[PDB]
Amino acid sequence: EDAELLVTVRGGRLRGIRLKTPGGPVSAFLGIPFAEPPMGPRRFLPPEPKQPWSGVVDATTFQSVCYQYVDTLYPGFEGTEMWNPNRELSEDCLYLNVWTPYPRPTSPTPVLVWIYGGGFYSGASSLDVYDGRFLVQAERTVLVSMNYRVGAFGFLALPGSREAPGNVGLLDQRLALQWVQENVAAFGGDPTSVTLFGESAGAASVGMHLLSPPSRGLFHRAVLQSGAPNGPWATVGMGEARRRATQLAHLVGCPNDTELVACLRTRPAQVLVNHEWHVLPQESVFRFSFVPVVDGDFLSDTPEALINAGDFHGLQVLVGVVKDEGSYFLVYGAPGFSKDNESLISRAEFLAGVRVGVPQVSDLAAEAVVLHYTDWLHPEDPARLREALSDVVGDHNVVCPVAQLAGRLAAQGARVYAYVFEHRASTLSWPLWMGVPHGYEIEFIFGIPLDPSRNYTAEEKIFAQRLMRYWANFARTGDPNEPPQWPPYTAGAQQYVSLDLRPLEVRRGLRAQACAFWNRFLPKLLSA
Template sequence: MRPVLATRHGSVRGTVGPAGIACFRNIPYAAAPTGPLRFAPPRPPAPWDEIRDADAYGPTAPKAPYPAPMDRLIPEADIPGDDFLNLNVWTPDPAGRLPVMVWIHGGAFSNGSGSVPGYDGTTFARDGVVMVTLNYRLGAQGFLHLGPDDSVPANPGLLDQIAALEWVRDNIESFGGDPRRVTVFGQSAGAMSIGALLAMPAAKGLIHRAVLQSGAAHHTLSPASAALVATRLAAILEVPATRPDLAAAPLEQLLAAQQQLRAEISARPDPELWGEASVNMMPFEPVVDQDTLPRTPIDAIADGTAAGIDVLVGWTRDEFRLFTVPTGLHGLVTDELVERAAAAYGLPPGQGVPVYRAAFPDATPGDLYTKIATDWFYRLPALRLAEAQTRHGAHAFVYEFDWASPAFDGMLGACHAVEIPFVFDNLAEPGFAPLLGDTRPQDIADSMHAAWVSFATTGDPGWPAYRESDRAVRRFGSSPDITHNPDHELRVLWDGLR
């Protein structure tokens, strides 16, 4: 018999899968953000009287395809429809009182969905967790802001995530979850979203633990930079840069304009044209608007906005190879480009690159470029978040994923996103095959997945907490498993800069 459970807006009928795991898909947590609601904060969904079938994934947020070759490497789901502010729940026991894990997907704030098959929550439910995935507004619909004088609240994509967490708080008991034990976890833009949520007043009390994979609390736009992006988007659409005109733009034209905008930033990453987006390489990101997100997240967190929230945070050793190896850029990098990139990231000219050369004496220019970019984008933000939390009474646990994928003749290394199927214990999922290649070590998936479940359940993933006195880092994929104060000279190099 298919299970029926009650929510505050109506009852839903799910399905039962392997090992008796009940799954409820396509549950609305907010109204369809269409027409005048395209850029507005989320509104509650309309209640329903009849039992709602929750047996299939619902619509996903509108988005353009990933640019090549990412479209062949990163799994994606695209289901048309307006009611895409929906979520999915897996539970082993609706009568239980179990820890809850909420997954926020990545995709550079312009792609992805909670309905990607690789994000199936069965393995987490199998191990005693109520698992939730969700969709949120992407691109301009989620993060457009017209600048300091914009009267409309920024960050509807983040406000969607908060609405979903409020749904969890109000409804998860019906699915066997404990609303006082909610761990939010995400990767890339999903992790950067969590970094922002930890600094947002509206998210206070909704998150009890947090896992941030390959993203932390450093990636935002100022209102001035957001205005540069919005003005250029309007110019591509050939409409005035006003809310009504942008809201009236046909969806397909809006998505095409976003694609063009992203390509223009990549081709000419000039700070005068794009502000912070020229370095972050993402035109749509959380905006520090003095309202929804009053301060840069890492600064707010350093001052205690997330005091007491334990975090598990980390990166993959070769993050940036995902963006250089498949595109062919890796072999084209010159020493001059390494110096220019280091300067753009804030390293002193003539000082930063020699430290990296000394640390990696056999590295090619492409290797050095990816090492520096990986540190700037991912490793340093993770360490700064861990440091901030430990200073405010929380436990921080730090990891590095360093299993090297055999794909692309081994050149991908431990690249961005390759750890996701290990966290989900879902190595056989076909969508991950282009990243994983033919060798998929189940023992790493066993240990990594178990660590995430243990952290959500007990607050302890199974290795020592990060302290500035010894800086313990758990490595998944190599020996020894625990290392202390790795790459000390590179971390110190960035002090005061990142």
């Protein structure tokens, strides 16, 4: 009985497992229960803490994936399959993982907490690209990840009601963050040095914890990759949340909030999932049915207001985006797009696509978009049109929300570092025209190129090791540098770095001209 694989936490005793990495062994505690299974009558309710247990819980493999739609756009393709669940679906899914050095460290060690993305409708901590064994081995940190409910089960809200309050997925995350504060020390973690980091909806989740005081006490630093809580897809208002919930209920046969939620609780999980995408009000891309709701509780105002009003002195933040944020959403709905051709669209398709990528704005707003992103010397060139639609979708949903957050937090007391990830992985299976798509820096942060079974180049393994060092240096010290430098981002100089095989290169302005349009002008237009 290895005692480096035996830990007791407040609930009971845990048996873990030691994993092999190229560089040595790692202790892994996979599938620790942190909540009572949110099933039956607990479907849609806030998570209740895991009641204590006798004996030893075997924490030796990932537990189930929370119920979620499974992508079938290109069945069998690696590019879509790598994000689909790799454990059975179940509503019993509230488990977290801890990776730690072998042997368990003696000094308290800074802790990285990972929150997966997936548009709040999908994702799991068990995906291969989120394997924490390489970061832990390479940088002597403690790594935690948790599952949280998604789709209807985590974010359906009948706001005001007690049976479907909404935001329960975020409360799953918050409960895991409390587990880390009362139990990470048993693994050698330091509960006073905790860095949240996430990507896409994970990055938006990280942001909502910054802006939610009950969560703000549970961590000290933040990394937001390719996402932000002020993005147009990350939240929904109380009214539109209730409309979507009510339409979901009508669609699956349900009729008073109590009666309605009680009826939903009797539907097979798979039945809800099968109608998830039907409650969306407009034909769209980068829009998800059940996302966090702004109801005055978890978020006391909208993220845009809270960001603008916040005092962030004492916070360090690391934020960034990939080079082609938008391309990957287009093959999911934009007319004329396929992974299987060059997707050289017509001007008529471009205009149709702008309505899909910028859904539910006015006809005037749509015109202002076409103005800014047309080239009026080459208004019909299909290459220019395909890259402009890609930039509309990426700027509107990721780059400009992220840029607004970074600028505000710098101006209001936080230290901010910013990056653009510019390396297209050699093993990438999406077509060349998509550039560096959404989500494909994650494997490099987690060190997956160091996997022997993975066929990466030796330079990519060097690059992976650079990025883990930046991330672990940030988690340890609040600054990705160690004694070319990486300058802080500020609202004036707007400095960021490029991450690729070349050494760090400083640049200025995260698509500044474009983002003036989305963050300054377009709001004013919608207000009149």
